[PDB]
Amino acid sequence: MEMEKEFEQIDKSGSWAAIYQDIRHEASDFPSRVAKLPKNKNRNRYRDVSPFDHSRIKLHQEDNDYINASLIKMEEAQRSYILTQGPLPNTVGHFWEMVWEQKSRGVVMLNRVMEKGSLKCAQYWPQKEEKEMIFEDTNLKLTLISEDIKSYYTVRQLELENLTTQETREILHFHYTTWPDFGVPESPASFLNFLFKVRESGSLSPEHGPVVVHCSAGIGRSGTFCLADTCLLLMDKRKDPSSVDIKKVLLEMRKFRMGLIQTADQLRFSYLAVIEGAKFIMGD
Numbered sequence: 335m336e337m338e339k340e341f342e343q344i345d346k347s348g349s350w351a352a353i354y355q356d357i358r359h360e361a362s363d364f365p366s367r368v369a370k371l372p373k374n375k376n377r378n379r380y381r382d383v384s385p386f387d388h389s390r391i392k393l394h395q396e397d398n399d400y401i402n403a404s405l406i407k408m409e410e411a412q413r414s415y416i417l418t419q420g421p422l423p424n425t426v427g428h429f430w431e432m433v434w435e436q437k438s439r440g441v442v443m444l445n446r447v448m449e450k451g452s453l454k455c456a457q458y459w460p461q462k463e464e465k466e467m468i469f470e471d472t473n474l475k476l477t478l479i480s481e482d483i484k485s486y487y488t489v490r491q492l493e494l495e496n497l498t499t500q501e502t503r504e505i506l507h508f509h510y511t512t513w514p515d516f517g518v519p520e521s522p523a524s525f526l527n528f529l530f531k532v533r534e535s536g537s538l539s540p541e542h543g544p545v546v547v548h549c550s551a552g553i554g555r556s557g558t559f560c561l562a563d564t565c566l567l568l569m570d571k572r573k574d575p576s577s578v579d580i581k582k583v584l585l586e587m588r589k590f591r592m593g594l595i596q597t598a599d600q601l602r603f604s605y606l607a608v609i610e611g612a613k614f615i616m617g618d
């Protein structure tokens with residue numbers, strides 16, 4: 335079925351939970367043996383969220399190459415994404431090592447450091463220009479260059495230096511600051527505006543490594559971001575845009591990381607975002 339009328343048909347029939355459970359039942363199951371080794375227990379935030387072995391990102395290190403991060407490679411859309419958990423106190427150096435080694439331009443952060451009165455990820459970037467961060471375990475230096483605070487999101491320019499080689503690179507940090515502590519946003523308009531700002535920066539383009547996107551676990555909000563981006567790109571590429579099937583795209587993405595889209599409310603929000611976004615693209 336088309337999307338917008340399938341949407342109304344699920345609303346009127348109140349069957350979002352059943353649609354979402356079908357997706358959960360059909361989703362791929364692949365091994366995640368490296369994630370479960372005892373030496374990696376303090377590298378995982380949640381015991382039930384792990385990268386599959388076949389798609390995990392490997393650190394270029396001979397001691398321990400593990401990070402909780404996955405490469406989502408979308409063949410028809412010609413887009414790739416790295417989805418990862420919010421960094422832990424003992425993985426901030428690994429996080430920036432990955433950014434460096436994978437040649438990423440942008441980092442997309444969809445959570446606040448504290449939500450619901452608990453810490454959801456480490457403070458992994460510097461908050462003042464004159465107070466830079468040094469990660470001694472991976473030999474990197476990170477400096478805040480500029481910060482632009484808007485009503486729904488903040489953009490930061492960061493400099494990452496590999497202290498071994500003295501090479502430097504500019505990284506863009508796109509921080510969506512207004513996702514509510516409970517539920518999903520009432521309108522997708524600010525989330526779509528944010529997605530378009532990431533696109534306009536070059537951070538999603540083929541001349542760079544894959545964008546790094548995270549929330550707390552790296553499957554829920556993060557899944558919503560890449561699902562909406564990929565669906566909109568396919569609708570631009572194909573002769574028949576109504577042939578884009580959001581459930582099939584989601585199942586394709588779940589071949590690369592488990593658990594993408596965590597609730598039926600997040601599924602409904604993803605439909606809403608793609609529907610509204612397809613009108614603004616045109617050509618409107």
Ligand SMILES: c1csc(-c2ncc[nH]2)c1
Binds near residue numbers: 377380422
């Ligand atoms: C959650 C999982 S591991 C962890 C941690 N590591 C160090 C401090 N807190 C928090």
